Design a protein around this ligand. Sequence first.
Ligand SMILES: COc1cc(Nc2nc(N[C@@H]3CCCC[C@@H]3N)n3nc(-c4cccc(O)c4)nc3c2C(N)=O)cc(OC)c1
Length: 271
Amino acid sequence: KPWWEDEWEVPRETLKLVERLGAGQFGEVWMGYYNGHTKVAVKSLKQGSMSPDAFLAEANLMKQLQHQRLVRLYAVVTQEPIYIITEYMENGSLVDFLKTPSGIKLTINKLLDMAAQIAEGMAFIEERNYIHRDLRAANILVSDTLSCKIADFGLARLIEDNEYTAREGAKFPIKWTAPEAINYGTFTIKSDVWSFGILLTEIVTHGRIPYPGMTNPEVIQNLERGYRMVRPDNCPEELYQLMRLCWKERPEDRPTFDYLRSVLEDFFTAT
Ligand SMILES: COc1cc(Nc2nc(N[C@@H]3CCCC[C@@H]3N)n3nc(-c4cccc(O)c4)nc3c2C(N)=O)cc(OC)c1
C-alpha cells in the first residue's frame, strides 16, 4: 500500500525527538512525543548504512504481529531520514532493568510473573506461524507498570513450511541460539523455545551472561557431551527443570510456548 494511502504513514511534523536512548552502526533510538502528548520511541535509520527496504521490512512485519504482549508499531516516516515509530516502554530493556535498584528488589515471584508474560507473547507469535530468532532478555522491554513485551523483530520471519533456513555465512549469538540453528542454519519455533530457556537464566540471575566462565567453543563442546548450563545461583529447581525441557536435544521434543506459559503461571500463583 502506497505511502499516501498507508494508515501507518505520518507526517514527520507530528514528531518531536527529545532524548536519545541509543546509537549504533545502523542508526539511533529516541524517546519522543507524537502530536505533543503521546510518549513514543522513534527508531532512526542512518542514511547509507543499510537499505531502506531492509530497514522498513521490520515495520511491515509488525503490521502483522499485533498483540498486547508485543511492542506495537505506532507509525512510519518513509522519506529520508526513515523512521519506525513504536509504543514507548518506560523501563527499557529487561537485561538493563533487572540491574537497577527497582529490578534488584524483585521477588522470585514477580520474576516468574514476567517470565510468563514473555511466554504468552511468544505463544502468540507461535500461533501466527512466526519465529523470532533473537529471543533474549536484551530484546524484552519493560513498561512503567513492570509489564513485559517482546521487541526487536529485525530477524523475525513468517514460516510457510515449518522452517526458515539462513545463509551458511550468517552468524548468531552462540549462547542464546539453538544447536540446529547454529549448525545447519535451520530455524523453527522450537529454536526460539531453546532461546527462551537461556532467557530464563538471565531473569533468575538478574541479567548475567549465560554459561558463566565459558567461552563459545567450551559451550559447544559441553552441550555436545549432553551437558546443559550449570544450575544458576538462587534458581528454583522447578524453573531449572523447565529450562531443561527447553533445551531438549530434538526440536520436536521441546515444549510449546503455550505449555511454557501455563507452567509459568502455575509457578507464579504458587509463590
Ligand atoms: C537507554 O535504555 C532505555 C530504553 C528505553 N526504551 C527503548 N529502548 C530501545 N532500545 C535500547 C537500545 C540501547 C539500550 C537497550 C534498549 N533496547 N528500544 N528499541 C526499540 C525497538 C527495537 C526494535 C525495533 C523497533 O522498531 C524498536 N524500542 C525501544 C524502547 C522503547 N520502545 O521504549 C527506555 C528507557 O527508559 C528507562 C531506557
